[PDB]
Protein backbone atom coordinates (compact mmCIF):
# COMPACT_ATOMS: atom_id res chain seq x y z
CA UNK A 1 0.00 0.00 0.00
CA UNK A 2 2.66 2.51 -1.10
CA UNK A 3 1.76 6.11 -2.08
CA UNK A 4 4.72 8.38 -3.28
CA UNK A 5 4.73 11.73 -1.45
CA UNK A 6 6.38 14.95 -2.77
CA UNK A 7 7.80 18.06 -0.44
CA UNK A 8 5.86 20.54 -3.01
CA UNK A 9 2.29 19.41 -3.10
CA UNK A 10 2.01 19.10 0.16
CA UNK A 11 0.68 22.74 1.66
CA UNK A 12 3.58 22.46 4.68
CA UNK A 13 6.06 23.81 1.75
CA UNK A 14 4.23 27.08 2.05
CA UNK A 15 6.34 27.91 5.46
CA UNK A 16 9.69 27.56 3.92
CA UNK A 17 11.48 28.63 0.69
CA UNK A 18 13.05 26.39 -1.47
CA UNK A 19 16.67 26.54 -3.06
CA UNK A 20 18.64 23.87 -5.04
CA UNK A 21 22.33 23.74 -3.85
CA UNK A 22 24.45 21.58 -5.53
CA UNK A 23 27.50 20.99 -3.94
CA UNK A 24 26.38 21.26 0.18
CA UNK A 25 28.77 18.73 1.41
CA UNK A 26 31.87 21.26 0.16
CA UNK A 27 29.66 24.28 2.09
CA UNK A 28 31.12 24.44 5.78
CA UNK A 29 29.55 27.80 7.27
CA UNK A 30 26.93 29.90 6.41
CA UNK A 31 25.67 33.67 7.34
CA UNK A 32 23.60 36.35 6.93
CA UNK A 33 23.75 40.09 8.28
CA UNK A 34 21.04 42.22 8.88
CA UNK A 35 21.69 45.83 9.32
CA UNK A 36 18.47 47.52 10.79
CA UNK A 37 18.94 51.51 11.61
CA UNK A 38 16.75 52.62 13.95
CA UNK B 1 -20.80 5.99 11.76
CA UNK B 2 -18.18 8.04 10.16
CA UNK B 3 -16.01 6.96 12.98
CA UNK B 4 -16.99 2.95 12.56
CA UNK B 5 -16.38 3.94 8.91
CA UNK B 6 -12.87 5.44 9.66
CA UNK B 7 -12.15 2.38 11.99
CA UNK B 8 -12.07 0.39 8.91
CA UNK B 9 -8.90 0.02 6.89
CA UNK B 10 -8.46 1.99 3.47
CA UNK B 11 -5.33 0.10 2.54
CA UNK B 12 -5.77 -3.60 -0.07
CA UNK B 13 -2.49 -5.06 -0.76
CA UNK B 14 -3.97 -6.02 -4.73
CA UNK B 15 -3.44 -2.07 -5.03
CA UNK B 16 -5.92 -1.24 -7.59
CA UNK B 17 -8.74 -3.32 -7.13
CA UNK B 18 -11.64 -2.12 -9.35
CA UNK B 19 -14.47 -0.63 -7.74
CA UNK B 20 -18.41 -0.55 -8.19
CA UNK B 21 -19.87 2.88 -8.76
CA UNK B 22 -23.04 4.55 -8.05
CA UNK B 23 -26.37 4.94 -10.08
CA UNK B 24 -25.11 8.13 -10.57
CA UNK B 25 -21.58 7.31 -11.23
CA UNK B 26 -18.05 8.80 -10.36
CA UNK B 27 -17.07 8.26 -7.10
CA UNK B 28 -16.89 4.81 -5.83
CA UNK B 29 -19.16 2.90 -3.19
CA UNK B 30 -16.89 2.33 -0.09
CA UNK B 31 -18.79 0.17 2.29
CA UNK B 32 -22.09 -1.93 3.39
CA UNK B 33 -24.54 -1.44 6.08
CA UNK B 34 -26.24 -4.43 7.15
CA UNK B 35 -29.02 -3.83 9.33
CA UNK B 36 -32.55 -4.85 10.63
CA UNK B 37 -36.03 -3.42 9.44
CA UNK B 38 -36.65 -1.36 12.56
CA UNK B 39 -33.26 0.02 12.55
CA UNK B 40 -33.64 0.41 8.42
CA UNK B 41 -36.37 2.70 8.65
CA UNK B 42 -35.13 4.86 11.61
CA UNK B 43 -31.67 5.57 10.33
CA UNK B 44 -33.48 6.82 7.02
CA UNK B 45 -35.63 9.27 9.30
CA UNK B 46 -32.65 10.85 11.26
CA UNK B 47 -30.62 10.29 7.90
CA UNK B 48 -32.77 11.56 4.45
CA UNK B 49 -31.72 12.78 1.36
Known amino acids: AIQYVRFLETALAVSCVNTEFKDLSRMTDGKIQFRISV | ?49
Open chain 2, 1 to 49: LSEMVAAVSGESVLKGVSTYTTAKGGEPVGGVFIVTDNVLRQLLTFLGE
